[PDB]
Every structure is written in C-alpha cells, then in structure tokens.
Amino acid sequence: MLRVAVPNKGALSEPATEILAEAGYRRRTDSKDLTVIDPVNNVEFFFLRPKDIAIYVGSGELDFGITGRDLVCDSGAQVRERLALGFGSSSFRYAAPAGRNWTTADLAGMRIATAYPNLVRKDLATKGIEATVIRLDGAVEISVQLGVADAIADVVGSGRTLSQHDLVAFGEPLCDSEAVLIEREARDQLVARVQGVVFGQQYLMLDYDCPRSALKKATAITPGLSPTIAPLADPDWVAIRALVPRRDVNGIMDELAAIGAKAILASDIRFCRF
Template sequence: MSKLKIAVQKSGRLHDDSMKLLKDIGISIDNGRDQLKASARNFPLEVFYLRNGDIPQYLKDGVVDVAIIGENVLIEKGNGITVIEKLGFSSCRVSVAIPKGKKYVSVQDLEGKRIATSYPNTVKTFLEQHQVNANLHIINGSVEIAPNIGLADAIVDIVSSGSTLFKNGLKEVDVLLNSEAVLAISPLITEANKTLLDQLQFRLKSVLRAQQHKYVLLNVQNEKLEIIQNILPGMNSPTILPLAKEGWSSLHSVINKNQFWEVIDELKRNGAEGILVCPIENMVL
C-alpha cells in the first residue's frame, strides 16, 4: 500500500508546531525517542525527521513527497520546489543586523562591507537587486557573534523576537524577506501519493481555516435583530433561534479573529447580551 512521505524538522519550535498540526488534523504518529522515521497509525503516512537545511534536497530527489519547512529555507535552498500551503506558524524574517553604535540609512550602506550569514543565496540576490557589492562570510550557526570578533561588519540571519540580536549588541536595520512554515511538494511525487496529499491538504485547510475564526453565540431583543444581523454576517447569514423569553432570540455566527474585538464592541453597543465565544476545531466548506 502506498504511503505519503512527509519531512519535518528534527527538533526545535518548527518540529513541535508541525507535530501539533498533524495531531490537530487527526493523525496519530508512533514515534519514539531519537527515531528518524515513524509511521502514522490511522493514515497512510510516514514522517521523516530531518535537519531543516537538508529537507529541500530530499524533496528534489523524491526521497520525501512533501515537507513542512520554513519558507526562508526553501528560498535559500529549494529552487524549483513548489509551496502548496502556507501554514501560519513559525513566523520569522531574514534581516540585516549591525552593531548598535553603527549608522544605517539604506542598503547602500552595505557597499564594500563584510557580511556574515547562513543564507548566502538570499543575500546575493538581495544585494544584486540593489546593485550593492559586499563580501560574504558563510557561517553555519552563531552568526550573531561575527561582528563582536571582528569577522564582519554586519550579519544577515533569521529574526523572531530580536532578543538574540539584543544580547549580542546588534540591531535589526533591514528586512530581506518574511517567512513562515509552509507545506512544500516534491516535483517527483507519484500520482498515487498526490491523491493522499489531496486528502491531507483537505484536513489541513479545515484546521487552518478554523484557527482564523471564532464561533459566537449571543442573545438580543427581536427589535434589534436586523442591526445585529448586519454586524454578524456569518458564513452566509447568522443562525437565529427563538428563546423561551418572549421577544428575544439567540444568534449564532462566526467571526474572523482579526476583526474579533471590533465586532464584539459593536455588538455590545447595539444591544447584544450574554455573548459567548467558542474556539472552532475544524471548518469544512
């Protein structure tokens, strides 16, 4: 029986978020400590635990069919690999950082400078786009220390909170690209495994869609129903149910989490009472 082969990062935050996502879509993984490969109990799926930087080559070679990987790694090493879904977690950016006491006005200030980075292809493309010449020092890990030991004038590395830069006396001055976890597909995936991937992606979409919304229940006087209904359009329109209390109804609807508090405030101003908010596990359209 065919099995879909998926690669995830061996350890770290991206690994943890990837495994949680697989769990959220109902896939149970039998994996023990330090295993490099594991099978799912309830879906034809094998999980490969790999170094993040190695995953693009495994995709190119067809060793794995799909991967959950940082978009920044694909941009650096995954030429020809297609992203089929953005997953909305493990957000970061690839940025230029320099010592706090140094001045930076624009990318032109990097002309002739020494830049330490683990992302040489990304940096070269960025510099070429701005017609800037600089000297690259390729470092795998601990890039932040390079300016402090006199190896570089600036660094280009991934940044999440910026705390690591701060601890090393650096400041972020320019952003090359923004990144998040994505689902990427091998160009060599078989037709049989494309069918399995469609099933997996269907589950992913329902969970990711649910994460962007909240389910809301509220009570309102019937005379205010039209106003509240205009505030709460829902997927097509709100569900309206009569309450035992005469002249009152209960409305059920869905709110995009990015508009949540604004909508709740407007509901309250227009007479909504007893507002309940519930998370949504899956949203199937």
C-alpha cells in the same frame, strides 16, 4: 502511499508533530525513530533535519515536507509553498551596530554574516548591490564584535539577542520564517486534513448580535474565512456567526461593540473541513 518529511529536531519539530497528530496520523513510536508508516491513512512519514527537507521535495523522493520558509526561501530547490502553517514565524532581516540610521544602501561592499547566504544574495542582486556574504552556522549576532562582518542578517525573534549585541534591524523583512508545508487526490486529502488543523488553531468562532443597519460594517469587520447571517424576528437585528483570527480577537470585539453589536461571544474550534 504519500511520503511525508517532518523536522526530526529543533524548533519546528514539536509543533509540526502535533499538527499531524491533531489530524489523525500516527506518531513515531519512539523518539529515536526517523520513520513511521500510518497503515490507516496510507502515509509514510520521514523525520529529517529541516534543511534536507526542501531538497528532497525537489528531487521527488518526497511528496510533501514541513520546513521553515527561510529555508525554502534559501534552498534553491524546485518546490512550492502549499500551506502556511502558522507557527515559527518571524521577520527575517538585516541589522548593524546601533550607531547610525542604516539603509539597504549602506550594504555596498560590507561583509554580511548570515546563516542564509543564498537568501541574502538573491535579495542583494535584486536591489542592485554588491557586498561580501559570509556563511555561519548560527550565532550571527556576534560576527560584528568578533570582527568578521560589518552587518548581519538573521531572524529577529524576540529582538533581545539583537539588542544585547547593540545591533538594530533596519529595512523591510527579507522573508518571514513561518513553518510551511511544501510540495515539488490523496494529496488533497492530506492538505485539507492539515489545513483544518491550522484554521482550528488560528481562528475562533465569534457569535454576535448585530443591528441591521450596521450589517455592512459588521461584515467588513468579520468577513470570516462565508459568514453566517440569520435574520432575527426583529427586523432591526440579524445574528452573525464568523471565524475571526485569534491574534486579534479582542480588537475585533471592540470594533463590534463600537458599532452597536451585542451579546458578543468568542469561542474555540478544533477543526474545519470546508
């Protein structure tokens, strides 16, 4: 009986609950419940607030969990990413008033307001700087005008909120907030089950007809996750079938066309088990 924790609420909830339904696990039979067991699949789900998720995967009271990477990058628990889930991903970073051109160097002796104080601190120690880290529970983009901080650190999502506070981001992302499946045989089955759901959400099938001399190029354009190559009666052609990432399927299709690919057809898939 695998015990698995899932965000009970917030932005990582509906999407994580959907992924597991998509994989044939039972849903909770009410929304106020914080537990369901699936008799068929032998799992016991628990529904926790994302930040209590890493911790309890680290102390061993849970076999797996779903949280955001920023939380784990910030938890300090003994846990490891076993899977990138593809949703809620954004750059985590620093930002300060649109006045200047900031550097991570300008952080020395500043107060930085952030919801992920430990994450900021490890990073700073790493870059050789010392500054003052203040914890806030949210609404960080206001700490500079309330006069509590000099700069911030947060996930920059749409960026709107930033600019609306005349903050600008600056520096390499400190983390990427992606939902993640973490751990500390029935465990591989769960992993694969989950993975097949993700790959089905992140890739499409491309079927195209590619000229033999472009075979090489074609396959650097679509390596697929083992692409299929089926030589056509015309020695000068070969049918190719590959999974390609969905966010950039059009550019890819355009690439194919520029090298002589024909009948380019993109189609959805649901799961993969391979």
